Amino acid sequence: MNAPDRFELFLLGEGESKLKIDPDTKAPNAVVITFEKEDHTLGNLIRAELLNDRKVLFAAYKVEHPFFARFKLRIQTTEGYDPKDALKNACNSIINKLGALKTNFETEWNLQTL
Amino acid sequence: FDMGGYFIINGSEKVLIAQERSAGNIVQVFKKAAPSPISHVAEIRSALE
Amino acid sequence: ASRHGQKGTIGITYRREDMPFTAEGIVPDLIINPHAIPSRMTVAHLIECLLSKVAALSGNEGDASPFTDITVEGISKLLREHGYQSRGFEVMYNGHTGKKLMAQIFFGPTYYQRLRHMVDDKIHARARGPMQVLTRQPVEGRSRDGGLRFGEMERDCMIAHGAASFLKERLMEASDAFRVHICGICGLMTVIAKLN
Amino acid sequence: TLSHLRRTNTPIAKPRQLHNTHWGLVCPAETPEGQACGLVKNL
Amino acid sequence: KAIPKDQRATTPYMTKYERARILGTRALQISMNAPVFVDLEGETDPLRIAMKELAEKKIPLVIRRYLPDGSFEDWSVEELIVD
Amino acid sequence: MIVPVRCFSCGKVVGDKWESYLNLLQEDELDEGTALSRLGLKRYCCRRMILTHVDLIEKFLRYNP
Amino acid sequence: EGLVEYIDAEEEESILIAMQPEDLEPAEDVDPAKRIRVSATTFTHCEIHPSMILGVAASIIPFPDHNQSPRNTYQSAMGKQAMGVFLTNYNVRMDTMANILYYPQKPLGTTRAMEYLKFRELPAGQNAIVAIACYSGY
Amino acid sequence: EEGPQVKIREASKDNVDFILSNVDLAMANSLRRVMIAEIPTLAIDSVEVETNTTVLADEFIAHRLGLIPLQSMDIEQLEYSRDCFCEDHCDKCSVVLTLQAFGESESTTNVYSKDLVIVSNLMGRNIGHPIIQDKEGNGVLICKLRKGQELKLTCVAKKGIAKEHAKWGPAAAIEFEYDPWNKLKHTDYWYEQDSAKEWPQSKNCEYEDPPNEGDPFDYKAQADTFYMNVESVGSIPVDQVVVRGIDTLQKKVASILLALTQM
Amino acid sequence: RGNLMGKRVDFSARTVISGDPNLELDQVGVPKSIAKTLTYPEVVTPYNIDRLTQLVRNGPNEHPGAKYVIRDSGDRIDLRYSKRAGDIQLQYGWKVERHIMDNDPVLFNRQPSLHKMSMMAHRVKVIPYSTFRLNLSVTSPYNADFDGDEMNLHVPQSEETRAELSQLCAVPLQIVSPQSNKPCMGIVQDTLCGIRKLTLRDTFIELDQVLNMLYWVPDWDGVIPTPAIIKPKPLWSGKQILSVAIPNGIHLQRFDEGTTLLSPKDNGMLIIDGQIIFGVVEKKTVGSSNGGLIHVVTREKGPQVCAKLFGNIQKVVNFWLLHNGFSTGIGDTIADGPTMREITETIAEAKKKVLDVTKEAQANLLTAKHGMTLRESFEDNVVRFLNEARDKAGRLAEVNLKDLNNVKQMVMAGSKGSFINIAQMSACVGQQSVEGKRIAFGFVDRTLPHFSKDDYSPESKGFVENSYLRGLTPQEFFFHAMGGREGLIDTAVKTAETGYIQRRLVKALEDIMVHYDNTTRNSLGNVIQFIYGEDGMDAAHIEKQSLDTIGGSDAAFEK
Amino acid sequence: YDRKVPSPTGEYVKEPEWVLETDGVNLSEVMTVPGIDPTRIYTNSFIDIMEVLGIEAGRAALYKEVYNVIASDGSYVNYRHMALLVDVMTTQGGLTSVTRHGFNRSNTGALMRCSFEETVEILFEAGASAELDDCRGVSENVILGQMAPIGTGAFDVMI
Amino acid sequence: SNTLFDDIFQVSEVDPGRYNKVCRIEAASTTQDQCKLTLDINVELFPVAAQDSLTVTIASSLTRSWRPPQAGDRSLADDYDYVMYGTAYKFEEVSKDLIAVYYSFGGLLMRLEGNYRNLNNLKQENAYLLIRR
Amino acid sequence: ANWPLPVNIRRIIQNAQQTFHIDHTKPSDLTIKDIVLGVKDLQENLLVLRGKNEIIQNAQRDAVTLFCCLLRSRLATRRVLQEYRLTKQAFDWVLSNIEAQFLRSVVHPGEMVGVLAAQSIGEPATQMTLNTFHFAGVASKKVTSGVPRLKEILNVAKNMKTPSLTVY
RNA sequence: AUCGAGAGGA
């Protein structure tokens, strides 16, 4: 009766973005980026791949409320080097390792019987 | 599975809950603080079968 | 509730992913706080969950029979020859992070009861509406979409905060605010009010 | 259904008690909590 | 009968009950478009506006505190120390 | 109340294994432990969705209408 | 055949009863984890088996002897608000309100007394997977 | 190869057990959590009951049908109902089914999924064949009929993911374990007398070394080497199950970079 | 008594309550469909019309919608109904009865209302799902578990009435107790067991989690503090990152019985300026105790400060516990082998030393003490004699619980449970009693048919030598029940006595209010007290202060 | 018994003293006794302690007794309250019961007295004895449905 | 912003008291009779046996929130292994002169006694601890 | 020694000795006239009641009295210049701030205590039975000795339960 | 809807 519809987990609504951008009001060269319609499959893999980059001062996320599936990401970087670029450049590192798994899996799968 | 016992009345089932009571025809001895006139009472409830 | 006076309602539902899982990938149906455990004493709930496991592995229906020769150290010798650890525990991974949970969890099968009383059958709200004729007070219970009683004991807590206009309100503009005509001498409701 | 059919109501020194002669005739724990507790007992 | 301008031995402090009420009586006035005095710094809650109107003691209304025997003691929100 | 499709905990198909259950339990005679195992049920989450099940439809079927 | 008498509370007064109809009768090394039992040699008649001090709702409880008794009572007042299958017949029975579990299951631990309470045939809950743990704090 | 090193040891039609070398954990856990939910499947989603004379109430049966296994390999070349342009459902978005069995026999008339009928044009692609694993060939008991009971049906099966209802999960059960011997010491053991005689030795100990007695704790060593076994319901054979994980993962790992290029 | 001092009222809701760790203390988890229904008469000002015409359009469905619009002449305009519901021109000075927005004042109570603290104003966060949702640390003054306790909500209609809630009844204002002069709300359960787990000197966290925790506290100044450790691997201490919630300007000194300014056993509690030196935070500090942090931070600016604090502590302990975990097994009630041997002989002597004092009155002489007379008598003598056979074993089974034992944790923290809770669970449940005396003789001169008449020994009047782990024996069992039963007795009945006791106390004292001259009076003008509490001083603002002019030497005084 | 006593040297050292415990009350004649301290003597009977020692002794006895009930095994109420209670009982002259008999007579407003235990018969005599009602109490204006002189109700607001 | 103390010490007792990680260490000073030391050392991270001698340099440098490394390589260690940052609090006394400090590395405490006094021991917030070999 | 007393000096003491953190081992700057003719003047203007007539001014003192005895005992010159070593500026603060903490700890005229004088009182008793239980034994006290002893108290109990006499 | 009965939840 008050249960919210099941699809409100990936179906983005009207006048809603899949990324939001505001800087942190306190620490400079730092941004809080608001992902929408997403859980810590994207909240987790993104932070722990923001850590390999030494050019990145800060990296964290929080599931704000189990009720609305949306996490916020806080990032702080080295003077002059954009945070938006920090993310952009970190995402492709994932992709690359992922498109690595596709190949490596099938190469080994094909060699198995049954 | 219905093992029954209920009386079917007006189209709903009714059940009889065992009523309780102090047994009859037994002589019992009662006190009964004294202030108060009396101090001791022998009592028997009495009814036929 | 379970079979042991273990009443407590759902507090959330986490999909199989956000759910803590096991070394084999067993998802729990059911998560209670280990805080409604000692309070509270109910050591049986524990043992039920310890026996019911073995039974689900060995195939054999377990004997949870009351005054009998069955021991925690008798189940433990069996759950130990079944590839789990003797007192029910299991190593678990946090679903949000796939990081091991630093403390082992107590995990297994406990027969659970669904009692009546579901929010959607209790949930009630009224803001104005149908009232009686005797008192012009809101009618009783959700069945005739009525209010709630602001009883004596309630009245007490209010004076306690000294909320003074709040006790004009919750006893005038939310119950009765009838309006009559008093006589300046013979202070009684008899005056004929020919209006407007 | 079972446990309603074998119910025992008592009208009105120490009545709500579980007493020694209750042993294995009335149920030691089967009783309606609050209201009229200890009065009504099941067999 | 009325106690004069002097001889004032109440608490010279705004009782929380005077507070809630004076805030309340004004929070009515604000909510029903009646003149607003302080520079409304882009706030629109008739509750929070009075909260500023009490910071800058600009509220016209005088609490008349009564004493058991009857005869009373005045004091205005401008005279009273908010705390 | 009719063996469930799959099992709430894991999710593995269980519906197809009730049929072979009775047959393994009764036709050539074995104990339950071996039953769930040859049926392929190794996880007890899923072992329980059969052992604990009672097929009430059976006695619903005994009715004329 | 003179093997079992009927005893009410009045006659019960002048009798001796053994528990545990074996315990408690034979002639006179031991497991430490097992429970602690006390011990007259002038018995009149034996108790059949302890559990039969319980009623219906109680005899539904696994190990009520390991359970703080006030709770055993709570469990009983709640056993009657359980959800299951009251009769096979319902799907033509016209009675105000009725609840039926989508997919019931027998329990896994079972008090012997269930067999006569036909419980393993008309259950009231599900043998779900239980995780006693702190997590979200919900 | 380049990064992640995947070594398979045991695999079949329904069970793929493998290692997964040289990855940080945040991938491993994101992987399964896409393998669970975010992979799409087809399964019943609009049932229209024409006639039911079974003891089983109407939406109860309807429910069970959702859960029933459905072939979904060519599922990618099927649009979503939301993302399709027709009205309710079409043949480029929804595979429609039908179910008919009638009590003609005195002695128990079983319904199965084998008794499901493909009604819509299949476009000739491989999609919407109810899965049979049954030794005999009768995939899963749907229902039971008696002497004179009918069940007349019309199913619409749609695309969907395990976030929207656990029927759409080509999931099953995901086995997960890193670090059998606690060398990383992410977890501290509950013991009574000893740990090694009170906790079991894990299947995953052959091909992972014993840490030795007098070797001081390794502080900075990280999460490498995870031991997984992925089970299939059957809608997607095991190989594709895992691939599509990676895929959908990347697919939405991309869908942000793209929407970032939108700002 | 039922229709003038206990009226039926409009604008009210009722539901099951559930826990939310991510709500804030002064908040209330109103379910959507209630807030679809509960109105608040608001007049239209040039301030609000922008939000308000936009509301009418949203209708009695879209959450921030509204029903009814009241006009000038007094005509009522239904909004689900009517044919002009899709527009309407808003004039100045019209009522626009509206749903409830987020952050509105509402009185949220629970029966039995046995306080003032049972009735508190709250902030409104309209939530999906149908449960009333609340802060885990606003549990204690209401008295409310989520086993399905049903709670209640009321909504003001004047703006003055509003103020009256948020300015008096507002949850934060009621944090410190004007009844027990100590803060009634505190960190409770998961947050309370884990805070302990966090602050263990032993407990470390690092980067990957550290950083996330900083992002958790909302008031974070974007300043990572410097990790107490920068050796081979940079760690933070559990204590460390906790300080981030501890606001800058707060100070705490404790000293327990074993506390050296070293705290070898990490005892006591030293906090400096919102940073933690040493100790382990538990119910004495983070708990609703007297000298506890919550008391401190509420008297040192301010209430709401303290209020936000609460919510922060949780959020971080919650996030830590989440990933570290905790449960409780049967193993946690298991006692070491050669120690439940040392308990059975601890009964075995305490029993055999009742057998001494039993053969005495059987002797008979006796030396039967002066009063202590008797019969009172030897029937008091055995009562302690086993109440000591229990409470010795209860301690013998505390030393066994090594620091991993999941139960002790919840006692070391005091989350829930204690000594007697441990004792009954591992040693023996003890001598049960009825009306203060060990089980009374029902049958003539005997307790049961399984005993012989006349047996004043323990296994015979209601003593249970076994634990709950071992399972009681029938004999024992039955008695325990009889006992238990007496508890569920006063639950419905003896409660009445006390509840009635109040209904008088309340009705008697009542209009005794401190008048405008600090002289406590009734309705007549009769003084009752000349300066309230004989010092004209509010309880809420008082603390356990130590007059160190009394104690000490005449010479320790001089120097 | 044990008793903290000022030692001539300065510190408080424990002075263990024989004290006597008695089932019985006859204060009147017991304190007159040769040998016992008639400054420290104390029966739990606060009813007789009142008739013997005047009203002010009673005041402190009734308190001490409520205390010994509430604040025994840990429990704590801040003086003010117990005190306040104690006081209300004490001032009318003797000991006034916290029941219908006592304070429900004490010349107070009628309607307020109507809202307790005896009900009708209270209004009956109110109608009989021609009683005038103050209208100053809590319950008076609750029944009449008004902002009663309570907390936010003490003062009226002007300009 | 200069190195502050340093002294050679020797372990007299290692007491694993209700803790697996982080021990307590009792140490007597080398050369300087008038001096004793008690400190909490993370034994898991840095093994300490009985009768092992150490190296204990203090210093106060080698708002600004905490960066990670970025190596650079902003100096300080390599030849100092065990490091901890903390805060000073109450200062002691027992002869006159001497005199003793209390340190708090986020819970892991320290007690050092001995009369050099110092005066290049400030009352201040800063406080490191560097331990090599 | 330990008693309910308003305004925590003990803390305003640690609030002084870390705000302006002196700290040592470096000597103060308040003359004996600053400390002493300070406390004894604060003692004038703490105020519980106000007036101007004799009776009020004496019932005033006879209410502060206790507080002062503590104030006097912790703001004493030896202490103020040995254990705590305050400065002119910091003491003038401890001076202003106690006064400030004090006239906040006033009972507000308005306060309805009669009610609050229950239920407090009627609460624990109610909830310290009604609890009710937990669990088994003994369990009172409390409660059984007890709450029916309480009943006695409020009734004017002529037929006393247990009449016990205690002689010294 | 009114009066009356019972059962159950905290």
Ligand SMILES: O=c1ccn([C@@H]2O[C@H](COP(=O)(O)OP(=O)(O)OP(=O)(O)O)[C@@H](O)[C@H]2O)c(=O)[nH]1
């Ligand atoms: O007859 C009753 C019984 C109980 N109550 C109220 O409900 C509560 C009953 O107890 P709770 O259910 O609140 O907690 P508990 O731990 O005492 O019991 P369980 O959760 O195990 O069931 C009591 O604390 C009291 O506030 C009543 O108002 N009346």
Ligand SMILES: [Mg+2]
């Ligand atoms: Mg509860």
Ligand SMILES: [Mg+2]
């Ligand atoms: Mg409850």
Ligand SMILES: [Zn+2]
């Ligand atoms: Zn399963």
Ligand SMILES: [Zn+2]
């Ligand atoms: Zn379509």
